């Protein structure tokens, strides 16, 4: 008969993994808007090859990059 | 002797057809990959306000802002 165990809630719980702070941004051409990326915060994070910059809005003046 | 005249023709004409001019990206929490901007070219343009600057990507050494 074969007591197959194909029904079991192996399952320990439900975490939902949700990345809301998931923001997509589009870029026209080569163009974006900085509003976009500064929707929630002022800065933002780049990562290049091992080294991580910062991407910063400052007041509603301008933006820069830092480190 | 066997009579087979093929008739399987289906010929993959149809390649890639997926343009990149229009570039999605997308933010995690509030960090991104700079590869994922300079895909296409080594320079993208980010208007704020009615000024617009230039964030811009050298060699593979590491990226800066200019106008």
Redesign the interface.
Same mark, same amino acid.
């Given at each position: 008969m074969m007591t197959a165990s194909d029904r079991l809630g192996a399952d320990p719980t439900q975490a939902a993994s949700s990345?809301g #702070?998931?923001?997509?941004?589009?870029?026209?051409?080569?163009?974006?808007?900085?509003?976009e990326?500064f929707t929630?915060?002022r800065?933002?994070?780049?990562?290049? #090859?091992d080294?991580r910059?910062r991407?910063r809005?400052t007041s509603?003046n301008?933006?820069?990059?830092t480190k």
């Open positions: 990345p #702070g998931a923001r997509a941004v589009s870029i026209v051409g080569n163009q974006i808007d900085s509003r990326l929630v915060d800065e933002i994070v780049i990562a290049h #090859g080294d910059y991407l809005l509603q301008k933006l820069i990059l």
